[PDB]
Scaffold this active site. Structure first.
Site, PDB file in Angstrom:
ATOM      1  N   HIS A 106       0.782  -1.032  -0.209  1.00 42.76           N
ATOM      2  CA  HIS A 106       0.063   0.108   0.028  1.00 42.76           C
ATOM      3  C   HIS A 106       0.697   1.142  -0.026  1.00 42.76           C
ATOM      4  O   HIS A 106       1.738   1.378   0.659  1.00 42.76           O
ATOM      5  CB  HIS A 106      -0.992  -0.175   1.241  1.00 42.76           C
ATOM      6  CG  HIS A 106      -2.423   0.691   0.883  1.00 42.76           C
ATOM      7  ND1 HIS A 106      -3.426   0.371   0.340  1.00 42.76           N
ATOM      8  CD2 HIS A 106      -2.404   1.862   1.493  1.00 42.76           C
ATOM      9  CE1 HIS A 106      -4.162   1.148   0.258  1.00 42.76           C
ATOM     10  NE2 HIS A 106      -3.922   2.203   1.132  1.00 42.76           N
ATOM     11  N   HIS A 164       4.945 -12.782   4.550  1.00 41.96           N
ATOM     12  CA  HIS A 164       4.770 -13.990   5.465  1.00 41.96           C
ATOM     13  C   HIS A 164       6.009 -14.765   5.823  1.00 41.96           C
ATOM     14  O   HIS A 164       6.109 -15.825   6.394  1.00 41.96           O
ATOM     15  CB  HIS A 164       3.681 -14.855   4.793  1.00 41.96           C
ATOM     16  CG  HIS A 164       2.508 -14.098   4.717  1.00 41.96           C
ATOM     17  ND1 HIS A 164       1.354 -14.520   3.965  1.00 41.96           N
ATOM     18  CD2 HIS A 164       1.919 -13.007   5.249  1.00 41.96           C
ATOM     19  CE1 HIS A 164       0.515 -13.764   4.017  1.00 41.96           C
ATOM     20  NE2 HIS A 164       0.769 -12.759   4.808  1.00 41.96           N
TER      21      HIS A 164
HETATM   22 CA   LIG Z   1      -3.168  -2.004  -0.831  1.00 38.88          CA
END
Ligand SMILES: [Ca+2]
Ligand SMILES: [Ca+2]
Length: 312
Positions: free
Chosen positions: A272, A285
């Protein structure tokens, strides 16, 4: 394909299943930890990360009638500073900054039971496009479409309808909306993880998609594939290629990636942009952590960055 290796800076760690990075209207940063469990049962969390110090605070640990959630993806609303969260067990949630939340739907517009959701993307008209790779929401026993094609796509509209717009996907994951320069939504991109494909549809209107097409191809034969995605301001689509150690960069016309971004970990899950910057926050992860790096340009403004009013 050219590969760049920008410097990744650690943001925070120990976030089980680190996912759904998002910024709200005040610039605060949040992520979700879908894999937190208690006694082997879902107890997923929604956290706020203080970008200074890296201090974490769990603002919401969603549960409906004893069923813990698996919050996996987020979008910030525009008219109110609240988060829309795709939950693999609870469907779609609307979470307040104070930590309170509401379950949006147990059934869709056709009366069919709702499916667990993974990620979502607001178009500029305020409609929320959602991927639902899980089977029916709690209390139904948990299932995922990694093997069978029962993953669906929904559009939660401005008039409050949860409309299933497509089905039979093998784990639909990341999702994004492409807009014309004038702001009109016109293309929906959906990642189908195991098949290593990015699908596109023409958005003809709210909850109206047509012309399903195999838009892009995700590199590698590794286990995994396209997870989260987002557009930069030039409409290049950046896609976390889980298991490949790279974030793929697709040009406006799709096809094969035109560039790759090497990450210092094998499993990028989502990303983001920080508003008004070239900074991309990445969840992964391998270490269940969050990082940030500088992209070549600013990100495409999210719905929450647009104005309901104003003149332009
Ligand atoms: Ca995003
Ligand atoms: Ca995801």
């Amino acid at each position: 394909i050219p590969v760049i290796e920008p410097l990744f800076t650690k943001v925070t760690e120990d976030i089980p299943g680190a996912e759904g990075p998002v910024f709200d209207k005040n610039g605060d940063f949040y992520i979700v930890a879908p894999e937190v469990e208690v006694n082997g049962k879902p107890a997923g969390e929604i956290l706020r990360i203080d970008l200074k110090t890296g201090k974490k605070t769990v603002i919401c640990k969603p549960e409906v009638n004893g069923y813990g959630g698996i919050p996996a993806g987020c979008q910030c609303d525009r008219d109110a500073n609240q988060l829309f969260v795709a939950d693999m067990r609870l469907g779609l949630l609307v979470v307040q900054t104070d930590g309170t939340f509401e379950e949006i739907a147990k059934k869709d517009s056709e009366g069919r039971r709702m499916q667990g959701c993974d990620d979502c993307a607001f178009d500029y008209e305020g409609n929320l496009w959602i991927t639902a790779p899980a089977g029916e929401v709690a209390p139904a026993d948990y299932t995922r479409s990694m093997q069978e094609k029962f993953g669906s796509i929904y559009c939660f509209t401005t008039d409050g309808q949860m409309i299933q717009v497509d089905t039979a996907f093998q784990f639909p994951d990341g999702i994004a909306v492409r807009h014309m320069n004038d702001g009109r939504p016109y293309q929906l991109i959906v990642a189908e993880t195991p098949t290593k494909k990015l699908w596109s549809y023409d958005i003809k209107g709210p909850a109206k998609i047509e012309n399903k097409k195999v838009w892009g191809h995700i590199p590698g034969t590794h286990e995994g594939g396209a997870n989260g995605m987002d557009f930069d301001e030039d409409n290049n689509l950046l896609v976390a290629n889980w298991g490949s150690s790279h974030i793929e960069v697709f040009g406006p016309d799709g096809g094969q990636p035109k560039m790759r971004i090497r990450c210092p970990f094998e499993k990028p899950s989502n990303l983001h942009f920080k508003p008004q910057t070239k900074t991309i926050f990445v969840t992964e992860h391998e270490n269940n952590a969050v990082w940030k790096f500088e992209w070549q340009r600013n990100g495409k403004k999210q719905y929450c960055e647009t104005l309901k009013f104003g003149i332009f």
